[PDB]
Amino acid sequence: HKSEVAHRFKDLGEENFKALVLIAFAQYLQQCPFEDHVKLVNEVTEFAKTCVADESAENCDKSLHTLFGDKLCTVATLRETYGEMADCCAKQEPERNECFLQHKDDNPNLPRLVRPEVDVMCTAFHDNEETFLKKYLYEIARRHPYFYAPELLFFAKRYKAAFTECCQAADKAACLLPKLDELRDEGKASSAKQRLKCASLQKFGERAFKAWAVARLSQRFPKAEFAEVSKLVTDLTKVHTECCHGDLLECADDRADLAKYICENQDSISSKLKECCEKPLLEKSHCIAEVENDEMPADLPSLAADFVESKDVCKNYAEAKDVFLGMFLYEYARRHPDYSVVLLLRLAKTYETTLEKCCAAADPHECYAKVFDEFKPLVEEPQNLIKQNCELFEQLGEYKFQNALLVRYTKKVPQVSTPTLVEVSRNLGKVGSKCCKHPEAKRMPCAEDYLSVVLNQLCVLHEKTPVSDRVTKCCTESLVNRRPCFSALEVDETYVPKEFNAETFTFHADICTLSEKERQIKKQTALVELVKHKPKATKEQLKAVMDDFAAFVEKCCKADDKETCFAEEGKKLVAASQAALG
Ligand SMILES: CCCCC1C(=O)N(c2ccccc2)N(c2ccc(O)cc2)C1=O
Ligand SMILES: CCCCC1C(=O)N(c2ccccc2)N(c2ccc(O)cc2)C1=O
Ligand SMILES: CCCCCCCCCCCCCC(=O)O
Ligand SMILES: CCCCCCCCCCCCCC(=O)O
Incomplete structure (x- = not known):
């Protein structure tokens, strides 16, 4: 229309408009106080209404980038608080907009946002729903300036719902906490998938x-x-x-x-x-x-028709290589929703290497004729991993399953930090408890989605604190080889055992008063330290110690003088266990 603000305002709504302007400003002016953005929002909203009333009103014809940049350059402490960014105000559109993009901090030094007690949240919520929610929307947006705004708004409404529902509950925490924890992870995953896809495209x-x-x-x-x-x-x-x-x-x-x-x-x-x-x-x-x-078409031909048996394969492939391969992928992908995208890519790459080393052969049709026979093992590898890993997960629970992974990956890369192994193994465990509940035909796509962020986060950390050449090998490898690369790691034999440290295996009754998550991570950390000390230990050998400790913990938290229990019994456990591990 003749007015951009008016248009967006009309087909967005006052509520949504006010929310997006807020998020938009918080993503650029991450250092300004909440009360400052609220003012900008109202001023911008007031303006918009003016334009809604009279499309020809002053400045209503200016473009959104222009208006947004102008109000931005209005902040007086711009230079004082954002230094260089203020120089953007001297430029003219669109150099100005570009300038702003470049000076947006993807990860500032803001304190970690802490979760207050359920009662304080619910009371704050009840007493002033709007500022309570806009204030947090602000805190989140300033910490994730690249997080797509509309996407961020969708989450906010899910949070609004959790409070509406739970603050009315008899047992607020039993209702709220599990929903907030889920919201956080779901949000962190969304954030990671977003940053992952841009990095890949680069x-x-x-x-x-x-x-x-x-x-x-x-x-x-x-x-x-x-x-x-x-x-x-x-x-x-x-x-x-x-x-x-x-x-x-x-x-x-x-x-x-x-x-x-x-x-x-x-x-x-x-x-x-x-x-x-x-x-x-x-x-x-x-x-x-x-x-x-x-649902996929009922009567669908066989891939081998146009791709293996056809006589014009190399002719059609040289005509437009990527088109043909894209076509191959299309026909292959739409007959396999049950495959992970990365798997389909492996097959296409494999089919590509063949056509390249066959269309340059005397008799093409006979060279590439058995290609589909080469897919089989590529397809089976991921399938078997799932079955095998989901079976185990059902035998043990999420927690115990996480311990198995702990032992398994600590042995493969003992050089990795103990808390990194716990974090990664716990997250890995979660992917199992989430995807294994699915029927076979949807498992692989599920694992891929979750496994991709966990593997990315894992690589980022290591990127910073490099510890193993192999992990870097897998991390810098092709996106399609990434997971198979980690799957191919084997027990590290070059590794030299960590010297026994008495402290590390000492336990006080405080674990008793600790929360479920706290106890676990407390035990899991000792578990990793154990494997780093006795890497050549057997599952049996290990399984024995673990269950011993297991009881020792319970048999001491449900005991009279707890501290001595852990002190006296603990002296024994460590002593015996060491003997059992020679
Ligand atoms: C690399 C992560 C991709 C995420 C993504 C997706 O799956 N769809 C998408 C795209 C086409 C068909 C089905 C889904 N679109 C998308 C959705 C709506 C829209 O209006 C613009 C784009 C996306 O951005
Ligand atoms: C008789 C059936 C044995 C199945 C089993 C297994 O494979 N692990 C196991 C044992 C050692 C290393 C890796 C896995 N443990 C186990 C798992 C988690 C835990 O915290 C305690 C013990 C088991 O009990
Ligand atoms: C128009 C469709 C474009 C798709 C082209 C098909 C190419 C598939 C090759 C497999 C991708 C592996 C990724 C890579 O190594 O670049
Ligand atoms: C070499 C002597 C140190 C042995 C100390 C045992 C500590 C291992 C803790 C294992 C964690 C058990 C986890 C669980 O609760 O199942």
């Missing part, structure tokens, strides 16, 4: 991204034509590129356009899009990106 490039997308979109819309999935991969690639550059306005607009395009060609893409396409502007996109895989 290192590996556009080809790999597009490949990843063709596969992913084909599993979802197995009925859409290949030309549609391509049209879509092209636009999706532009969307992410932009959204990754960090410009919110461009990003949002590109996501909107794509969501409308999809909804309009709905019948030509997937049946599962009805619900999503009815929802309001601010959710259409979110819904869609989350949509379930449509």
